[PDB]
Design a protein around this ligand. Structure first.
Ligand code: HEM
Length: 154
């Protein structure tokens, strides 16, 4: 699948507002994921002891990881589909070390769309959401293909 230039522009336009507060978006997305799908929290030995949203919001450690997550995803998006090099080490560690099924990549994709919809309604209308969903579907499809090459079904 291939996105048009118009679709990439919708994606990068809303991402530019995300980059105004990377740590805050990183927090909201991870907390959203953990509250909506609590089984994902079990993949993080670092975090699985956090019992409540209040404890999550206070964790400087979780906030740091949100920044790492959003910075990696941002670098991928800015490649506008030319992301094979960024994707190799990410697929390797999430297949082999962390063992993250594609289903969980779908769950965090929903958290991203939900947070952007909440914080940026003016820049995340139907067309912009469609473009963002397409970009994330492309990310997941390419990561799934690498998973298969590396020997993990996901
Ligand atoms: C857009 C989706 C995601 C991106 C861009 C991303 C990115 C990253 C990056 C850059 C790291 C640090 C380096 C590395 O180990 O590769 C990391 C670590 C990690 N990721 Fe992800 N990740 C994503 C989704 C997920 C999901 C959905 C889960 C689990 C449900 C997960 C589980 C983990 C774990 C357990 C670690 C190790 C954390 C630690 O102990 O420090 N990742 N991720």
């Amino acid at each position: 699948m291939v996105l048009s230039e118009g679709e990439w522009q919708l994606v990068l336009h809303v991402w530019a507002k995300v980059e105004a507060d990377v740590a805050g978006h990183g927090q909201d997305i991870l907390i959203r994921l953990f509250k909506s799908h609590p089984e994902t929290l079990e993949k993080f030995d670092r975090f699985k002891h956090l019992k409540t949203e209040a404890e999550m919001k206070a964790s400087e450690d979780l906030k740091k990881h949100g920044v790492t997550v959003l910075t990696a995803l941002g670098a991928i998006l800015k490649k506008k589909g030319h992301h094979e090099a960024e994707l190799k080490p990410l697929a390797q560690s999430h297949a082999t070390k962390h063992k993250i099924p594609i289903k969980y990549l779908e769950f965090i994709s929903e958290a991203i769309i939900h947070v952007l919809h909440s914080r940026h309604p003016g820049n995340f209308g139907a067309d912009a959401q469609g473009a963002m969903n397409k970009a994330l579907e492309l990310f997941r499809k390419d990561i799934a293909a690498k998973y298969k090459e590396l020997g993990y079904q996901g």
